[PDB]
Amino acid sequence: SGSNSTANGANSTASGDNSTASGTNASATGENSTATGTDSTASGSNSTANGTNSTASGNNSTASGTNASATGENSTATGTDSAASGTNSTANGTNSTASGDNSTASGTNASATGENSTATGTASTASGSNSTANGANSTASGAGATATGENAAATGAGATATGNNASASGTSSTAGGANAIASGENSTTNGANSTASGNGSSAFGESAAAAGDGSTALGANAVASGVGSVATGAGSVASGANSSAYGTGSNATGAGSVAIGQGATASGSNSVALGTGSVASEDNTVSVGSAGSERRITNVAAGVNATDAVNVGQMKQIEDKIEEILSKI
Amino acid sequence: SGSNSTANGANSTASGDNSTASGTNASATGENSTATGTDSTASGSNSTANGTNSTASGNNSTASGTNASATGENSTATGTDSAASGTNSTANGTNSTASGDNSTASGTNASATGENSTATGTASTASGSNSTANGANSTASGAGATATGENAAATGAGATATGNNASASGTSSTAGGANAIASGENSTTNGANSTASGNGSSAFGESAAAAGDGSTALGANAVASGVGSVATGAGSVASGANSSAYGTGSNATGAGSVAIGQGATASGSNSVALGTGSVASEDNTVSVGSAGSERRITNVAAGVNATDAVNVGQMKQIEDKIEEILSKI
Amino acid sequence: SGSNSTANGANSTASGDNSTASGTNASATGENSTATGTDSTASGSNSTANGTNSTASGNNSTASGTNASATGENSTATGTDSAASGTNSTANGTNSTASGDNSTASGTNASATGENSTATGTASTASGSNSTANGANSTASGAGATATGENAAATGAGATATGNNASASGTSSTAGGANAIASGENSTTNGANSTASGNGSSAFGESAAAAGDGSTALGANAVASGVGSVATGAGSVASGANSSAYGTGSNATGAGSVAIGQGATASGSNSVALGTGSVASEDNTVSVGSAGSERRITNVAAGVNATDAVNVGQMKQIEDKIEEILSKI
Ligand code: NA
Ligand code: NA
Ligand code: NA
């Protein structure tokens, strides 16, 4: 009964201006409304409903598909049983739900229920505030969480996960790479199959592991398993408490040990192995090699204080003195 | 008036072949066109328009919703006031706009205006050429920019940002982690709340900070604030110009200083602190410990040149000589 | 002929309950079905078809647009020539295809053909199992591959690429940054224009390059080109086999060489340059400076074994002895 309006089908209603109802009990009551299908409803302003029992009751709403429902202001729902119920909500796919304000859900059973949430992919879930999930079966449930990849999961507050099966579960955790795990508080990992599980741990490289609290493991298969350990280099190990290893295959296993160079090994407490292949097994020493593989130390200035090193020139002056004491005797 | 065509409603037109117009002034003039709603228009080839004042005028266009407009070739627009105007453009959501060629925009007020641009999320913006934004309120405005996460922003040319509130604003900058900032030219940061603000700076770890030009900070809360500084380890600091710190809690504060080991500290100019807990405060020295905590240096080969170090065996030969000069006297 | 059903147009059929067919040969045969357009077909349960030759034959299917086809269970297709044929499949855009089970494809010519695949963007491709592509022209073709950014490509099994033109082509490879390349097996790179091309290589920083097998390059423009090389610092180079460089502009070019400090250079085989500006050119030595720029070594404990270093206090005891041998002579 509205202006420039048609109502075809039994008990259909076109009361809105510029409205077009069609189908048994199709109700196009909003202004500029179009309702198609049995029991379809376009009651909002500028609303369009297509499909049996479809509902476009929000202002500026569009619902397409059987039982599709666009009840939010500025809502759009496509697919059987889709629901766009938040303000500024958009749903595309069967049984998709965009129920948060400013939410967008795309894929069968995709769910964007947080404020400002976005879920893309079948059975993706963006349930945290300001959460973003992109990938089938992905989950961004933490506040500010972002998950990208199939089965990626960002569950910590401020967590970010990128990669198939990646998991960022600690507060302020970040994981990148397939199967990467950032589970410590304030943990960061990047590399497929890498793990940063200590609090304050950071790992970089495929299969790198920073399990110590405050540990840092950088390089493929690097291991920083001690508290406060640092390991840089593929296959490096810093397993002592407060240990430091630098170089491929370096090994700092003593408490406080330091190993610098490819294949350097330091097992002594507070010891240092300096140089490729150097070995420091004695506690509280600096080794510049190993037995049979000693190194000269060069560009040493003359020592002055009692615990400074001595250079050859200082010794040669004593030798010359003894020579002359050989003439005087 | 087209073949296999129906036109129900006043002043409706079905001139295209296989065309179906329905509604006051519904115009289904394209081939294989279907126009539903008052003033709806399906004028393109293989075009489908549903909703009051909806327009599908592109070839292979589909417009659904009041005022929805699919004017590009191969364009698809769903939602009230949606607009797919580029070639190969797709828009889903109220007031979404896909105006670039090869552009895709999903979410209320989402905007994909660059060539090859993709925006997913309420009020997301992909305005750069080859730009990608995924997250409510995200922005990829640089050329080749990619932004993922709610309120993520990639504004530099070639910038990439991943995480809630992440920001990549320098040229060729990359930020990963919630609240991460890559603001220097050619800067790279990964870790929640991390910052790479120097030109050529790189930071890895939660709250790591590389503010120096050409600086590198690796580990949770690491600080590389000097020009050309390098800090690796949780809580490491390299604040001197051209300083280097390796180990948890290491501190290289002198110009040109080097601190290697957990808790090593080097404040002297061009000094080196080698070993856990070592201290180098004297300018232009290498310290292997600290006063009271001296270390032996081991596996030292006999010195040859004047500035080589001397080992015990060389001294013992002088001692034996003096012993015999004790017999001869 | 179904209950609460209307069939307007020649040879249209509304046999389903609550079904509404409209248009020449429009077939609304499913329960709660709505078919609009010439030759449109809504045969599934809870199915809705809009557009000439549109087909909604899946249960809970919705097809919109000319030739649009929703044949999968729980399938939704929007756009001319769109096809949602997998179980739980969703397609939005002209010629989009969601043919995998649990697949979601958005954008003109977007293709989600893998199981659990998700493609967003014009001409995006998610063809691997558990693959995710987000960006125009992006490709996630590996098993578990994830690609984000325009023209991003994740082609390895378990590969993850983020950034415009980023490429992760090795097994378990991860690339982040515009133009980043992770091409080695188990390679990881993060930084625009960075490359990890060795097997087991890892690179961090803009334009960092880890081309050696088992190499690690950390810092802007760092180069770890030797087998097993490690370079940390902007502009650092570790080009020797099994070489290690730490510090901005450090250079470890000898086999087994180690350079620690900004501008330290070690060209000797198995040599070590320790300290800013130190130079180690002699094979199998540890240099603490360079000629003209020698450093004292401090906090050295008295040597005990033959290859331990000697400190000044040990030499002063010999000097005092010689003094007294000067009185006795
Ligand atoms: Na070990
Ligand atoms: Na400090
Ligand atoms: Na070089």
Numbering used by the authors:
A (entry chain A), B (entry chain A), C (entry chain A): 2 to 330
Article sentences:
Gram‐negative pathogens like Burkholderia pseudomallei use trimeric autotransporter adhesins such as BpaC as key molecules in their pathogenicity. The TAA BpaC was first extensively described in 2013 (Campos et al., 2013); of the nine predicted B. pseudomallei TAAs, BpaC is the only one associated with all of the three features involved in pathogenicity: macrophage survival, virulence, and serum survival (Lazar Adler et al., 2015). Studies have demonstrated BpaC adhesion to respiratory epithelial cell lines, establishing the importance of BpaC in the initial attachment and tropism of the pathogen (Lafontaine et al., 2014).
Our 1.4 Å crystal structure of the membrane‐proximal part of the BpaC head domain shows that the domain is exclusively made of left‐handed parallel β‐roll repeats. Having settled on BpaC741–1054 as the region to express, we used the engineered trimeric GCN4 leucine zipper (Hernandez Alvarez et al., 2008) to preserve the DAVNxxQL neck motif at the C‐terminal end by replacing the coiled‐coil that would be in the membrane β‐barrel in the wt structure. There was a single molecule in the asymmetric unit, and the TAA trimer formed around the crystallographic threefold axis. The final model contains all of the residues in BpaC from position 14 in layer 22 to the end of layer 42 (residues 741–1021), followed by a long neck from E1022 to Q1054, the GCN4 anchor, with 282 water molecules, of which 42 are ordered in specific channels or the trimer core cavity. All three chains of the C‐terminal head domain of BpaC thread around a central hydrophilic core in a helical fashion with an average turn of 5.7° ± 0.6° for layers 23–41 and a rise of 4.8 Å ± 0.1 Å (the last one, from 1008–1021, has a turn of just 2.5°), calculated per turn, typical of other LPBRs. Instead of predominantly β‐branched hydrophobic residues (Nummelin et al., 2004) at positions 5 and 7, BpaC has T@5 almost exclusively as well as a number of hydrophilic residues with T/N/S/G@7. More surprising, however, are the “inner” and “central” chains of buried water molecules, which form because the BpaC core is uniquely hydrophilic in 15/20 of the LPBR layers, composed of repeating units of N/S/T@7. In BpaC, only negatively charged residues face the solvent—in stark contrast to the primarily positive surface charge of the left‐handed parallel β‐roll “type” protein, YadA. The pIs of the solved LPBR structures demonstrate this clearly: the pI of the LPBR is clearly correlated with its position within the passenger domain, with BpaC having a pI of about 2.3 and YadA of 9.2. The structure reported here of BpaC741–1054 contains the highest number of LPBR repeats in an experimental structure and is the longest, at 89.5 Å.
